[PDB]
Structures are given as structure tokens and as C-alpha cells.
Design a protein around this ligand. Structure first.
Ligand SMILES: *[C@]1(C(=O)O)O[C@@H]([C@H](O)[C@H](O)CO)[C@H](NC(C)=O)[C@@H](O)[C@H]1F
Length: 632
């Protein structure tokens, strides 16, 4: 189906039952040994040298088997590679193993944290105690040099050091058992700290994540105070605008994402941005998978990249590996980078010298290879999208809005708000799709006719659905359940028989409940909808006149503004309970595929969506600049 893009290609770099590694016998003799499966990929850039790290599972692909950490490195961007076994296992039994490498690059050093086991045949979280385990830190040093035009490099690996003595016996009364790195690429924070996200198993077997960091290049390590809820594993971390963003694997439920502004001391779920957006399968009740999560700069803009399989086949098949790019506001699906319906798995992404690559698993009959992918077609699309984002943000921020009684300048009022601006439906549209100017989430349309910057509705179900929970598996507007601002310019074209819908956020579930919204009636009054509260008519409007509508929701309170002023009933609680609402979609006009044959004769233009509640000054600015923001 969707797949590795034209222009892109790949090679089977770590070839199952084919590629050999320099296995070192007890006597020190080296033997090129065949490897059943290569798993747990990570590819990073160390001073210009590509370094690929992986589990070499010599005899079988099972987790509790004979495994050592293999490395392939290249000084020519993948033209050629050298192979080493960077970390040996204990050689204690037929199942001794060092596994699940988590890597940090600082300068010309590579810090690799692995889980080392001697003889257990069951899963690490299920062990009776931590006795078969050791968390091992290994430092590698990359040295390159050129003699007569040819550049080559070597990598020396230090002796492993166990961090077991630094592991607290308890965290808040929680008795600890074992811990392993989050798997994949970790980071050096802006303050120089080595930051490893770790997964901790407690005695009873619960798992949760934490930040383990070093302020002195690995001489000492500290476990920060904060942690994820239980149930989180294989965390990936990146630094964004002064905060650590921790993206967790969650078997059997949606992926939790946290932010910490204080080196992991305090964690706050990112309910307004990325938490619960991604998941393990269409139904979310399947085994989840490791994901890479890296911050990069493309076309002058800082963005985050995230990889994860759709896993339509379920369990560990992990078919359809996708790559997403986000600037913490918009979330773009770059596409599927694996091929057809092949099984993929754990993955890594790297942006080096303006070229994008991936190292990821492919699985056939549970025999694993690692492919090295040149994401050429994908980078081209990413750059195009980032240019769209920059261009539209700059354009909007450059509009000279009208001065207000307390302004100061090129004689312009406040800038049109662009911070937290997530989607925008304006001019571009056809008969079936109203395009998101930011190219992420389009709205579906019915019985509509184009007008400058929007659509005029006429017909049963005429209107548009901007999907929220209806996006399905990946819920990019999941933030709306926590807070949002929806804006639009509207005209009522023909009087309704009784009451008819105009704009709002619908809720999943029976009946036809709304979280917040606005309708209009035959008496030419507005009918704001505040959660489940009885709607009472208020105010006055006239046919054919343009009105500005703003819906705000934050802290469970909802307000509805018409022409910059709140309608009666605004400002009260719209969601009772502690459980987050579950918005199905935002409706524009009166869309529907069933139930009452709604036919709202209205025209709507310039629909803007923010992931926060706009303040009074921003609402006034939008009200005053309605004629200036359209893409027409
Ligand atoms: C991944 C995998 O699902 O494919 O699973 C890890 C854990 O088994 C899983 O998170 C449950 O605890 C394996 N790691 C270990 C140490 O078991 C990974 O190696 C990988 F197998």
C-alpha cells in the first residue's frame, strides 16, 4: 500500500543468516560468525561517521537467547561499512546476552547503555529479583583520519561498566528490580548533560519510566525524581524549547507523552500537544512497539521526527512503518517508509548532512534483517511542508491589523495569532475535501459550493467534518479534548425551520451530544451549546450579514463569541467529570450521514483551529482582521 517513496531506496545492511560478525572466542581468536537475526536498530552520526548499532541474535530471534551488540560504521555515507561486535555478553550460558542498546553521542564519543543477562529464560520484567541482570555502560571513541585523500575511521570500545551500584533500592517506597535504557537514540541536553530515558521494572513487575542523567560525561549518574504512570516502557527523549519531551511505549493503550522543564524532576503529561496521539494498532489494544523520536532542523525550522508501525496485522507483526514530522503544533504524516504490507518493527531515523536515512527491522517468519534506507522522496516532501508552514505563518504574522484604542509602529494593531495555530481551512477546496492550509488534516465536505475562502452549504447534510477522534488510529487533534479555540467567519443564507447547526465540537457516543457549539434559529437568535446544558436562545442576527464566531475551551470551561463579544451563558463548565472528553469531530455547517436530515443554509469561511484558548486581545485581533487572513 502506501510505501517507500519514488526516489528512495534501501539495502539489506544487516542480512539475517548471511551477514557475519567478528565473534571473539574465549581464547581471543576471532571467527566470522553467521547471525540468525539482527534486531533493535539505532543509527547515529559521530563526527561525520555513520554508526549503526544492533542486537546480533546469533542463534534465534528470541529475546532470551545468545546476543551481543554489533556495530557497522561508514565514513562514506553508506557506500562501504566496517563491522565489529562492540559489546560482548558474559558467556555464562547458552542464553547470555547484552541487549537493547540506547545510545548518546557527545563529540567523538558514543555512550551505549545495554541490559546484560546471564541465564534467565523468561522476560526481564518477570524475574524474581535483579540478580541475573546488570545495566552496562560502554564508551566508544571514534577517530578518523586521512592519508593521501582517503578518509578512514576506527572505533575503540572501552570495557563495560556496570551501573548496578548506582541503582536505588526504592523510589517513593516503590521497590526496584531492574532497569534498562529506553532503546535507541538518546541525547546530550543543551547544558551538556548526558540524558538517558530509562524503563524500570519494580519487584511485582510493573514498569515505568524515568530520566537518568549525568552532569560530568558519565562519571556519575543521577535518577531524576519524576516518573511516568505505570504501564510505560521503552521511552524516547528529545529536548524541545527548554523541555525534555518523553515519548513512551504503552502496550495495550495509547502512547503517553510527558514534558519536564527541570531535568526530569517534575513531569507533566502533554495533554495539549502529543500525548495519546500515537498508538499500537487501529484498536489500541495490541502489543506496542519501540519508536525513534528525534529533534532535527529542516529548512531552517526545528521539528520532531517520530517513527512507528501502523501494525494493522496486530501483535508483533508491526507492518507499515510510518514517519511523522511535527513542530509541536501541526503533525504531518510523511508516509509509510516500509514496503507494501511487509512486517517491519523497531526503527531509527537520522538526518545527517542534509540527507535523511532510516535503519529499521524487516521480519519474515520471525527471522530479522535491518534495512538501511535513503529517504530521498520523504525528505523532499518534508521540506515542501516545512516551507508551507513557514510561508503561511510569516504571511499571517505580517498582516497589518487595525489599530485599537490602546495600540502604539507601522500603524498596525496586534499581530494575527500564529502560536498554537494548528489547522486552517480557507480557499483551497473541491466538492469532497476542504484542504488544511497547513497540509495535515483536511475536512470532508458534502453538498457544498465554493466561495472565496470557504464554502456555501445547500442540501441534506451540507457542511464539513474536520475529524478529531474520527481521524481513527493516529489522533492528531487529540489536544482538543484538553483545550482549543475554533474560529470562523459565517453568513446565514436562509432562515431555518426551527433550529439548525452552525459550528461546534461533537462528542463520540449515543444521542447527539456536543461539547461546545453554536446553532441559530427561526427567530433570528443564536443558540450557543454549552456541554449538556439546555440551550437557551440569546441575542439577534440578520440574514446575509457576516459574523465572526469564536469557540474557546480550556480548563473545562466553554465560551462562544459572536463579533468579539461573549454570548450569554459563556464561561461555565462544559464537561463534568475527571475523564477527558472524546471529541469525534468539529462540524462546520450541518454535516451528517444519518439521523435528522439537517440542511443548514450557511456560508462559512476561514476556519481556524488553535491548540490553546486565545486571550481577549487575540480574539479582538481576529475579529478585526477577518478580511485579511484568507488564502484567496
Ligand atoms: C521488544 C519487542 O517487542 O520486540 O520488546 C522488548 C521487551 O520484551 C518488551 O518491552 C516487554 O518488556 C525487548 N527487550 C527485552 C529486554 O526483553 C526487545 O529486545 C524487543 F524484543
Amino acid at each position: 500500500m502506501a510505501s517507500l517513496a519514488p526516489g528512495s531506496s534501501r539495502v539489506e545492511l544487516f542480512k539475517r543468516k548471511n551477514s557475519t560478525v567478528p565473534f571473539e572466542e574465549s581464547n581471543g581468536t576471532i571467527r566470522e560468525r553467521v547471525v540468525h537475526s539482527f534486531r533493535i536498530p539505532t543509527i547515529v552520526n559521530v563526527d561525520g561517521v555513520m554508526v549503526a548499532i544492533a542486537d546480533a541474535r546469533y542463534e534465534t530471534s528470541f529475546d532470551n537467547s545468545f546476543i551481543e551488540t554489533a556495530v557497522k560504521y561508514s565514513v562514506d555515507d553508506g557506500a562501504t561499512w566496517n563491522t565489529q561486535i562492540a559489546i560482548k555478553n558474559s558467556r555464562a550460558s547458552s542464553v547470555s546476552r547484552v541487549m537493547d542498546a540506547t545510545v548518546i553521542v557527545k563529540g567523538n564519543k558514543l555512550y551505549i547503555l545495554v541490559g546484560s543477562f546471564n541465564k534467565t529464560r523468561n522476560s526481564w520484567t518477570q524475574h524474581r529479583d535483579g540478580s541475573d541482570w546488570e545495566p552496562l555502560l560502554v564508551v566508544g571513541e571514534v577517530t578518523k583520519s586521512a592519508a593521501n585523500g582517503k578518509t578512514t575511521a576506527t572505533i575503540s570500545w572501552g570495557k563495560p561498566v556496570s551501573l548496578k551500584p548506582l541503582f536505588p533500592a526504592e523510589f517513593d517506597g516503590i521497590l526496584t528490580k531492574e532497569f534498562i535504557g529506553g532503546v535507541g537514540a538518546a541525547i546530550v541536553a543543551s547544558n551538556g548533560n548526558l540524558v538517558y530515558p530509562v524503563q524500570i521494572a519494580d519487584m511485582g513487575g510493573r514498569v515505568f519510566t524515568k530520566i537518568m542523567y549525568s552532569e560530568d560525561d558519565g562519571n556519575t549518574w543521577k535518577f531524576a525524581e519524576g516518573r511516568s504512570k505505570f504501564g510505560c516502557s521503552e521511552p524516547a527523549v528529545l529536548e524541545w524549547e527548554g523541555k525534555l519531551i518523553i515519548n513512551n511505549r504503552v502496550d495495550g493503550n495509547r502512547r503517553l507523552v510527558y514534558e519536564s522543564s527541570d531535568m526530569g524532576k517534575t513531569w507533566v503529561e502533554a495533554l495539549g500537544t502529543l500525548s495519546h496521539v500515537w498508538t499500537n494498532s487501529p484498536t489500541s489494544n495490541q502489543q506496542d512497539c519501540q519508536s525513534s523520536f528525534v529533534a532535527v532542523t529542516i529548512e531552517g525550522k526545528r521539528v520532531m521526527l517520530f517513527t512507528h508501525p501502523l501494525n494493522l496485522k496486530g501483535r508483533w507483526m508491526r507492518d507499515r512503518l510510518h514517519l511523522w514530522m511535527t513542530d509541536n503544533q501541526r503533525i504531518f504524516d510523511v508516509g509509510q517508509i516500509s514496503i507494501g504490507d511487509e512486517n517491519s518493527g523497531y526503527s531509527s531515523v537520522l538526518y545527517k548532512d542534509d540527507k535523511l536515512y532510516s535503519l529499521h527491522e524487516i521480519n519474515t517468519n520471525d527471522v530479522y534483517s535491518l534495512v538501511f534506507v535513503r529517504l530521498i522522496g520523504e525528505l523532499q516532501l518534508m521540506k515542501s511542508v516545512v516551507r508551507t508552514w513557514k510561508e503561511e505563518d510569516n504571511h499571517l504574522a505580517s498582516i497589518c491589523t487595525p489599530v485599537v484604542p490602546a495600540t502604539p509602529k507601522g500603524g498596525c494593531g496586534a499581530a494575527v495569532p500564529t502560536a498554537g495555530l494548528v489547522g486552517f481551512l480557507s480557499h483551497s477546496a473541491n466538492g469532497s475535501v476542504w484542504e488544511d492550509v497547513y497540509r495535515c488534516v483536511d475536512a470532508n465536505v458534502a453538498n457544498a459550493e465554493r466561495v472565496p475562502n470557504g464554502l456555501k452549504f445547500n442540501g441534506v447534510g451540507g457542511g464539513a467534518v474536520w475529524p478529531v477522534a474520527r481521524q481513527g488510529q493516529t489522533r492528531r487533534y487529540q489536544f482538543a479534548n484538553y483545550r482549543f479555540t475554533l474560529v470562523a467567519t459565517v453568513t446565514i443564507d436562509e432562515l431555518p425551520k426551527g433550529t439548525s447547526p452552525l459550528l461546534g465540537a461533537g462528542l463520540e457516543g449515543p444521542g447527539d451530544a456536543k461539547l461546545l457549539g453554536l446553532s441559530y434559529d427561526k427567530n433570528r437568535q443564536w443558540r450557543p451549546l454549552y456541554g449538556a446544558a439546555p440551550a437557551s436562545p440569546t441575542g439577534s442576527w440578520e440574514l446575509h450579514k457576516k459574523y465572526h464566531v469564536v469557540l474557546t475551551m480550556a480548563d473545562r470551561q466553554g465560551s462562544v463569541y459572536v463579533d468579539g463579544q461573549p454570548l450569554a451563558g459563556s464561561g461555565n463548565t462544559v464537561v463534568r467529570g475527571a475523564t477527558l472528553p472524546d471529541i469525534s469531530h468539529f462540524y462546520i455547517g450541518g454535516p451528517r450521514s444519518k439521523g435528522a436530515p439537517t440542511d443548514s443554509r450557511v456560508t462559512v469561511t476561514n476556519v481556524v483551529l488553535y491548540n490553546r484558548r486565545l486571550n481577549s486581545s487575540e480574539i479582538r485581533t481576529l475579529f478585526l482582521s477577518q478580511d485579511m487572513i484568507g488564502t484567496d
